[PDB]
Each structure stands twice: as C-alpha cells, then as structure tokens.
Design a protein around this ligand. Sequence first.
Ligand SMILES: CC(=O)c1ccccc1Sc1ccccc1C(=O)O
Length: 284
Amino acid sequence: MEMEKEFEQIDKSGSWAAIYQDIRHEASDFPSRVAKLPKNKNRNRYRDVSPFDHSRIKLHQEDNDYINASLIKMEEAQRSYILTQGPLPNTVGHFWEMVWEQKSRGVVMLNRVMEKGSLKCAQYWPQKEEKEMIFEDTNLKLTLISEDIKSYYTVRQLELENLTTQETREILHFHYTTWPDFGVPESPASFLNFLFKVRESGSLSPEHGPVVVHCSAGIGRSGTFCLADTCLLLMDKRKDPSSVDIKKVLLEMRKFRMGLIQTADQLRFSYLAVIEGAKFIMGD
Ligand SMILES: CC(=O)c1ccccc1Sc1ccccc1C(=O)O
C-alpha cells in the first residue's frame, strides 16, 4: 500500500496512537545484562534505556568495555548507524574513544545541551579554537577547527588526535539546533535539508565507519533520523517507491536498539519526512 494513502487513511481515522502501540507490542525483546551490571550504573543516563548485549558497541580496553551505544546494521539498504545516548560528564572520554575505534567521519546531534531548563547532555566538544579539550582517561585531544552557523543547524570541523600514536583525523559535527523534546522537527523541509547535508559530507558512506547519532536517550529523534534515511535509500536502490513498508523497517531497526521512535507524533512525522523526501528521490 502506497504509504501516502496509508497516511491519509490513518489521519482521517485518527488511529496514530493505535498503529504506534501495535509496533510497541511486536517489538523485539533481547537481554541487556552488561548494561545492568552494578559497575555500569553511572555509564547510563536513563534506567529504562539500555543497549542489547548482541548489538552493543564494545570499547577496546580490558578495564571496562561498556558504553550505552548500539550498532544498527541495515543489510538490504547497505547502511550502518551507531545510536548512543548524549554523553555524561564521566563518559565524554568513552564517547570519543568509540568515535576513534569505530573510524566514524560524522557525529549527528539532534538535541540542545539544555532543553526544558535541564541538562540533556554534557558539553563534549570545544566552543573556541584556542581552548582544546584533553580526555586523560582515554588519551585523546579534541580541537575546534571551524564552525558554520545556519538558521536550522550548525556544522563544525573538529580534529581528533590519538595522543598515544599522534595519528590525526578530521571529524564533522552536524548539530540540528531546533528540535523540541518529544517534539517533531517543525515540517519535513528543515529536517530533510539537514539529512541531505549529512549525506553530501560523505559521513554516511561505506568508505567510513558508521555515523554516530545521538539525542538525549538516543532512541526518539535519533530513531526518526535513521528510519527516514534508510526508507529513502530503499526507494532509490530499487527505484520502486511502493516496495517500502515504514512500519516493517522500524521493527527491523528495533531488533538492534529498544524504543526507537518514542511517540505516535514522531511516527507520523517519520511518514511525512519519507513522503516529502521521495518527491526528490523520484527525479525532481
Ligand atoms: C584517517 C581518515 O582518513 C579518516 C577516517 C575516518 C574519519 C575521518 C578521517 S579524516 C578525513 C576524511 C575525509 C576527508 C578528509 C579527511 C581529513 O583528514 O581532512
């Protein structure tokens, strides 16, 4: 069924809350035993958001290999994503270790450091060229190279140095700066514009390790970004737009990380973004 007609049918019947609960009911349930170990309690922002053991990203150290991060591997689309929580004051060094070890080119940030008057994640990148950050626990240095501030988003160029080997890489930071908590990113236009800027950077391409994507918990807004990207890619790979079931792609993604898409409004917005973005994919 053409999703654009499924859309209008759900809208006219007002059954978004009912579709959403059907997804919640059919969603995979896998163990998260490492996340729940007592040594890892201060590595988790939220008690009810954990990575599954089978898909969790492992840090390359014997001490404690744990970070609240998941590898989402989409086989047919040939895309991978790392979805993670907003880093904590004590996990900022683990976050940049993961970026280094996984060979990511891009970090996509979909939240503000403060929302609704509370801190949603640590200030994990330098705000001034001349004030670089050193992460002593993981032996990394991070420097702001340049910053490009637009109306809906900011792009930053960062330099990541492994202080152990003196190897250096440029990492791109894509910061979507106007998405409300459990809210919807305005209208498909600014969201899709931001997605196409990440794609044009090379950050999502197979010559690079997986993009790192986060919001506060790494499931809501983060889920919307990778669902919309993957559904548009599947329309392209076969150029048969009808052969895309958004609910089935979401359930496939939920085998790798729990809770992706947090509200029935986020589900509806994901549909809008895919339907409007297809009007480019199909040759316009
Ligand atoms: C070592 C390496 O090549 C690399 C691996 C992963 C992420 C970033 C990088 S660095 C990079 C990637 C693309 C374009 C320019 C640069 C740059 O170094 O300016």
